[PDB]
Amino acid sequence: LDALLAMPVKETKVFVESNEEPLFVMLKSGAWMQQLRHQADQGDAKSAFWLGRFTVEDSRDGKTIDEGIRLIRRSAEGGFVRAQLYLGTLYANGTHVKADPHEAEKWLSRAAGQGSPMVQLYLGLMYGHGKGVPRDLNKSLFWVEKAADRGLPHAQLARGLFASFSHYYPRDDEKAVLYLTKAAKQGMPMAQFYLALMYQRGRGVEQSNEQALHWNMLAAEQGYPDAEYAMSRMAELGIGVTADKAWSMMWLDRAAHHGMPLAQYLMGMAYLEGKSVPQDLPVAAAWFYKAAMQGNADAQLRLGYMYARGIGVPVDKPKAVAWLEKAASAGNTVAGQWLKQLD
Amino acid sequence: KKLDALLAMPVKETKVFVESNEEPLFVMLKSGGAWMQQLRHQADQGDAKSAFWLGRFTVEDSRDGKTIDEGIRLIRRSAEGGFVRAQLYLGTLYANGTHVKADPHEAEKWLSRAAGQGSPMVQLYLGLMYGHGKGVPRDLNKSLFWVEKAADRGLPHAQLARGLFASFSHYYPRDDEKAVLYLTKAAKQGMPMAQFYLALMYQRGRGVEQSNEQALHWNMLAAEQGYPDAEYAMSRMAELGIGVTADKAWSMMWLDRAAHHGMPLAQYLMGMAYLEGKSVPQDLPVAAAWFYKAAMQGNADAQLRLGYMYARGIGVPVDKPKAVAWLEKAASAGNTVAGQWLKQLD
Q: Of A214, A213, A215, A196, which is closest to residue A205 (Cα–Cα)?
């Protein structure tokens, strides 16, 4: 069965960035109580927040939550930054109150206006989102860039990715390198990975294979899979170092064991065609399987054929078409051609 | 005369019901003044509730590390006392590595006790963590135990999750008979996603005897709630006469709903509808508009078709950089003819 090896292999770029929008990438990461309430009703804005917050979280009664939200709002009127942020998220997510974008914007803009750079980055990421607060990409860049200039590593990465890989924010490769470097010096592997990507592709800075090797190494030493795969390509094509196919797949092995579906699929390829490692069909099918579950249509295609004819695995026609039509739905044409053959 | 090559491109047929290609496990995962002295007195004399309230307040308010230490001791004093809230809070501290260093076995201890006497929402939350492996050691058997525990108590999310784990997961085993059981329980509580997958089981004869009548009834209830995947299924049933008589007019109201509801596969067929001037008057700009809406959601056939239309100026201005941008994004998905046109553009 050599028809599986005869298909042309898809050559990838040295650095493989995420296809996901950076916005959604960043947007994912007794008697004592009577004494306490008496303090809040006399002006203690801090007692009003903590009693009110722990009231709406330790109760399912509708009227108990309402009487706790009053304490949270009363503390927000007093200007407590924690109450402004807590009441602000309540209106952005519609939790326990009507989802009010104008009311959510007011408290979150106040909390960010006097709060930590984390809260400022939080408001900025939500300003270019539309849900919760009204969409405003200018106010979004302002709060994100302000939180970055204060030293927050996450906001620096966010500002760099927005001016480099976003379908929303303007493209400025020169400014992206400035903020990616600010976060890469602080130790963020993703910031070091994306900074090395810029240094190689010549976006925003002068092309330098010496520079791309430095920042991607710092990210690869930390175990960042995308950086480890970039090391597999740099070592194979002799970029920044001399060519070393053996060392190339040392990196490919790390990124595969670290969970990267692209590396796992290429590891399955490596053991399928015994060229850089001894041919091991059951191990090749196991590597295709671990990436096929993560949605890699290329691995789903290889594993489906190995099931249709029993290479490395038993002959299982149910499981064969199970992965084939799961890969054809992802746009794999040849997967549907083989699927058309199995009745 | 340039449309002939575009119109001759084959359309990607789909099943009557189109389920998500993502693993169900990952999908479910995304789904001091005078009052304090009075409070601290209750804590130091057995009141585990007061020890938790003071302890949690002290660890989340204060900035001094010595106050955070004193608060966690109060939380542990309340957790050892048997308070469910303290067991849960202390468990997540060891699962996330917050303040204390992450201990998956110590996290499993306190989180299992919280679920052992807590709400089904807590039990499902722990059951999913067992399947994820983060925070607690991965154990698929313990995962199913706490997911079934929350599902058997009437929680719809766990009922849907247990049904999905028994029919569309590669981590958990396959039991189509069990899948229909738990999907039915969540469907009766009005969950549109549960009703959709339940109708899928009836229509494909998995776990129950094949029935288009039942598959029409449950998918109807789901589609009437605006569930886009169910609305697309209704369009496929109405056009093919499955449990109903064929109605190409009714079949495109479901397709129109599912497209505006953001479903990429429906947006693609909307593009096909206005490209081939058969069921509707041909409108090339509108076809490229629907293709674009579906192309930026991963649909490799909209990307191929929008790319060709960008290359030849069909419904859009001629734009070679945008054409190659779409053609290679579809050729990366595995579209053969998408790469052929890419080779014809240098």
A: A196
CB spacing of B38 vs A31 below 8 angstroms = yes
- Please answer yes or no on whether A330 and B298 come within 8 Å at the CB atom: yes
Spatial distance between the Cα atoms of A118 and A112, rounded to a whole number of angstroms: 9
Show residues of chain A in contact with B44, CB under 8 Å: none
Determine the residue of chain B that is closest to A50 in CA distance. Answer: B57
N residues, chain B: 346
Q: Please give the distance of CA B28 from its chain centroid, rounded to a whole number.
A: 6
> B158: closest CA among B172, B144, B171, B169?
B144
| A contact test, residue of B11, B18, B27, B35 with most A CBs within 10 A | B35
Chain B residue numbers with beta carbons less than 8 Å from the beta carbon of A10 are: 332
| Torsion (CA) B237, B243, B246, B250 in degrees, nearest 10 | -60
What residues in A contact B45, CB-CB < 8 Å? none
- Report d(CA A23, CA A167) in Å as an integer: 9
Under a CB-based contact definition with an 8 Å cutoff, are residues A45 and A333 in contact?
A: no
Strand (E) or helix (H) holding B261: none
What method was applied to determine this entry? X-ray
- Say yes or no: A60 contacts chain B, CB-CB below 8 A: no
In terms of Cα–Cα distance, which of A116, A93, A114 is closest to A104?
A: A93
Residue A169 belongs to what domain range? 1-343
B57 contacts chain A (CB < 8 A): yes
CB atoms within 10 A of CB A291: 26
Could you tell me if A217 lies within 8 Å of chain B, comparing CB atoms?
A: no
Stated in angstroms to one decimal place, the resolution of this structure is 3.0
**Residues of A146-166 as b/e, b for ≥16 C-beta within 10 angstroms?**
bbbeeebbbbbbbbbbbbbbb
SS (H, E, C) chain A: CCCCCCCCCCCCCCCCCCCCCHHHHHCCCCHHHHHHHHHHCCCCHHHHHHHHHHHHHCCCCHHHHHHHHHHHHHHHHCCCHHHHHHHHHHHHCCCCCCCCHHHHHHHHHHHHHHCCHHHHHHHHHHHCCCCCCCCCHHHHHHHHHHHHHCCCHHHHHHHHHHHHHCCCCCCCHHHHHHHHHHHHCCCCHHHHHHHHHHHHHCCCCCCCHHHHHHHHHHHHHCCCHHHHHHHHHHHHHCCCCCCCHHHHHHHHHHHHHCCCHHHHHHHHHHHHCCCCCCCCHHHHHHHHHHHHCCCCHHHHHHHHHHHHHCCCCCCCHHHHHHHHHHHHCCCCHHHHHHHCCCC
How many domains are contained in chain B?
Answer: 1
